[PDB]
Amino acid sequence: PTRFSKTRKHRGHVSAGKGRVGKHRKHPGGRGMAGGQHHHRTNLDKYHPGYFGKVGMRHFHLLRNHYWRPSINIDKLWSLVPSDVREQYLSGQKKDTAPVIDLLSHGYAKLLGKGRLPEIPVVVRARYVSAEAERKVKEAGGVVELVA
Amino acid sequence: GIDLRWKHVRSSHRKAPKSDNVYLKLLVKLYRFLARRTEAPFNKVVLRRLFMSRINRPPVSLSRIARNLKNGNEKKTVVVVATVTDDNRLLQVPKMEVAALRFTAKARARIEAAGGRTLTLDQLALEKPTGANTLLLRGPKNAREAVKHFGFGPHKHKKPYVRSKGRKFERARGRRRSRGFKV
Amino acid sequence: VAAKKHVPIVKKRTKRFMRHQSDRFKCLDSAWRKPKGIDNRVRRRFKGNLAMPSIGYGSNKKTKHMMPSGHKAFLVHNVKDVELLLMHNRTYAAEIAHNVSSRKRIDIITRAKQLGVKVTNAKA
Amino acid sequence: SNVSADLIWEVSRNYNSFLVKQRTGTFSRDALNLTNQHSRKHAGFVNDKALGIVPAEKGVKVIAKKVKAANKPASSLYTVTYKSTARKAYKAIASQAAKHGYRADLRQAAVARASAILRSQRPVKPEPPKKLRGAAARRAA
Amino acid sequence: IWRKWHVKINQGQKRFATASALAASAVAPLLMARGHQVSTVPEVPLVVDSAA
RNA sequence: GUCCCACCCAUACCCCGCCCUCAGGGUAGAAACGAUGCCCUGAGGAGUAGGCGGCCGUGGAGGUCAGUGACGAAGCCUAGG
RNA sequence: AGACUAAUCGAACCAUCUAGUAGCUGGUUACCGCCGAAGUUUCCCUCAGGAUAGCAGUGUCGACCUUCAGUUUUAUGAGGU
RNA sequence: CCGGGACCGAGGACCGCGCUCUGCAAGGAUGCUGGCGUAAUGGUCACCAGCGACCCGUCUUGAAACACGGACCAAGGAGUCAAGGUUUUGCGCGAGUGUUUGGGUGUAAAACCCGCACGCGUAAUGAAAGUGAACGUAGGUGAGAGCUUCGGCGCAUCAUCGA
RNA sequence: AGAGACCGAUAGCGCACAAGUAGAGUGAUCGAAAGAUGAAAAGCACUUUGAAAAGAGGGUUAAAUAGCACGUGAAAUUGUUGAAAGGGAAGCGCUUGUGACCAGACUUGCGCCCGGCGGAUCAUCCGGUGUUCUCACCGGUGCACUCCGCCGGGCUCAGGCCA
């Protein structure tokens, strides 16, 4: 919508808000990233510290599928089971049955452990598991088993 | 001549909501009457918070409510002039009654499942016109992505604008003594 | 009928604020325009030149928009519109639009006389 | 509920089909509107209780709104015609609006509107002929 | 010819508005204020007994 | 050259009227209100480059005034209001 | 003789690439209201130009926080005109 | 304590402070009287008179300039559009969010409906192999709006010492 | 072939017309201007002045203030008639005066008392209907010191302009 913009309010005022002494010429200072090392250095060092240089070794023909392993913390583990069944376990009505969670079927490969876990035994099947996550699931009565 | 430093100086705070919601306009009318003819300071604070924009009314969560429901506050009424959000980490939800601007679908269900009650800012004025036995809450104002970029500079430990992250994007000169200097 | 009693009307100015240098060139209308010249003598408020319109020339809020009789003009288009002035005959006056036919013009005047509403342009 | 008299005023505050807005003032061409002004107090079509007066062939005709049948518009108006005497019509209208708490704030306007309608049904006197001041010399020839 | 002619709006907001409009269709004062002539209709949610 | 009386006038100072801007108050067991309204009180107004707000006109599109018109629409002329 | 080669020669004429690039001249369209500058610091094959800090406007939030100040007073230090 | 003159009359039931207290000069003008009811008061336009008044636009420390453009009139004539960023305003849903590449359907370039994948977000850090977030009621101390059984509990955010 | 929040004769393709035409260049090539009488030509017979072009009468038409220089016909520039000013520029600002021309407003309204004319129907009660459930409408009953309209006479209050 052009009916309300600052160009309509500039009618009748010479120079259209760009100044008299500085007249808004074509391209003062250069085009694009010109002057990175010569006259735009002061801007390119106060912000963007690190534009120039080489760091690290290079990799030819990287395939990102080799590096796919999404992770999930341990405090969100109970959120995988459906709500109706979930409330039964926390309320304490089963007392004799344990759930078996399959992380791969939900799209996870590594089980990290960050929060706390209630004292109910579970079984977790993961491709990878952290050292701290294995201890917390074990002290709750459960066990974690690798599945590949 | 009068030799003054300031003249015709305006106010610095909002005096009316910029939103055009019809129902919100009614809610401002109610509390504008209450604040004028009541001595309780609780009414004046609620009125101003109705004017604020969305970034000045950050959401609060169920977990943050349960944090402040201890040390003798289990019987008070929680008032939040913002949205209220369910937390997936909290397994057991305590019993409480909450007066909020709006609730998410899951937050409303889990509050009443435990035996609670969900109120509304208009019903709150009908039950507690003076705000007795209430506690106000806010969300984390600075917990926003855009705030991390504020005040960038050397030796400030802020976040830069980069189109991607990796070893090829910045780092290098000015980030390690192996290439020139460091910041 | 006569209008309500009101305070006396003061205009504060009658001239029309003509445009600078419009009396020497035929390509410029007389409608006022703010001069933006860097060294214009009118913009700098030199002594002995045309004045410039300011908010200090405004009229009283009580007597604003009312003609010297005491009424306020109201543009009408048919006989149904003039009946909106049934309850306002001491504050408002009717005015027939320029595109109304001659036959409908006398219908409005006849109806307006019953209600006592003054008509600004009726002698035709 | 989600609908009330206050809400309808909020939706129709700025523009509605009955609005007549121009310079020097704004008006409303509403049947249930006394004084034909645009205001919450005088907006008949939004309030639950409203009054309206329409001239009949001989006298005034007054219609009121029945709050019990809001959703049924064909039978939502209580109408009555007064054609007996000016003073008798004045008393009935005032009692109809200020005896049982049915818009007692409209008592003064209802009587005044009825007074104007009856005044407009009298025979009109003939206006005196116009005179001439500067064209008198012209017309002498 | 490659200026932006069409626009994209959320399906959630589309459903909110079409539900809001239906609610306003059962309010007789709003019907009159939009210019309709409903002074002689029995009920404002008019329903016909499947004669059509 | 020095000293002493009276008098003359700036858009400056004092008192009064009116306009706008800014700030602080009053108004629902509503006989009520363009609540964006109305009522009461005080102070202030120079400005290029530049910033923001409010409003007026032109060509088209949706809705609405059950709008004006061959008994004369649009356009044009007019020291007539 | 840098002479002549269709009134054109220290490199002819016609169409296209082509709306060739310009730190340099010229222009940049209605009204009212409120606030209101800079020619100085550091770096650049930089000196008719840019980036950086300052001066300026707008949007706000925290309290109405009793905090503040181009000022005087009292006690006590520094200086080499 | 008594004279003389000029300019002004804002407000519109009662309420107040007071006094010389059957009343009043005390929170803002009323009383009596005359001529005329039309060109008389008032308004527009042309001309004479007293005083004031250098040609506009532009670059510039400085323009009425012996600085540049402009003989006159009518129509045309200059911050736009797309992709990608960023902060701020309004709106929907909210640990999630996005129907429209595509399919179903239709009064047919409109409207309405459906889901598998995928994008951004939910976890960081190293060049890399790799590893991967609770001693405590998710901590201690000083300020903090609001609430309070008056003892105290203390959101947002700021500073500081730790995990 | 079907369509548009596109342009409307200096616009839209260079071309709405005998336009890639007229015209320019030895040549490759360059390349315009120009739409509209009326519903229907009914496109002015006949007479008279003139060498002729044409004029004056008289005709057609709703209109010739539409006559093949044709719908509407603006500005720069020009002619005639009317009004006014001028001793080496003119224009313009503030404030009176003279002359010309002109818009408003006022020309009655309300109330009381006496007299006269004309009408059905004021308080009250009964039946029916509606409604805000105590306030009204309709039918009947009134029947002249009541109620309503008009005319004539008398009186109070207010109402235009300058002092």
Ligand SMILES: [Mg+2]
């Ligand atoms: Mg400017």
Ligand SMILES: [Mg+2]
């Ligand atoms: Mg310029």
Ligand SMILES: [Mg+2]
């Ligand atoms: Mg610049």
Ligand SMILES: [Mg+2]
């Ligand atoms: Mg260099």
Ligand SMILES: [Mg+2]
């Ligand atoms: Mg001043």
Ligand SMILES: [Mg+2]
């Ligand atoms: Mg090296």
Ligand SMILES: [Mg+2]
């Ligand atoms: Mg004026």
Ligand SMILES: [Mg+2]
């Ligand atoms: Mg200057």
Ligand SMILES: [Mg+2]
């Ligand atoms: Mg002055």
Ligand SMILES: [Mg+2]
């Ligand atoms: Mg002042």
Ligand SMILES: [Mg+2]
């Ligand atoms: Mg256009």
Ligand SMILES: [Mg+2]
């Ligand atoms: Mg016309």
Ligand SMILES: [Mg+2]
């Ligand atoms: Mg030589």
Ligand SMILES: [Mg+2]
């Ligand atoms: Mg040649």
Ligand SMILES: [Mg+2]
């Ligand atoms: Mg030659």
Ligand SMILES: [Mg+2]
């Ligand atoms: Mg060559």
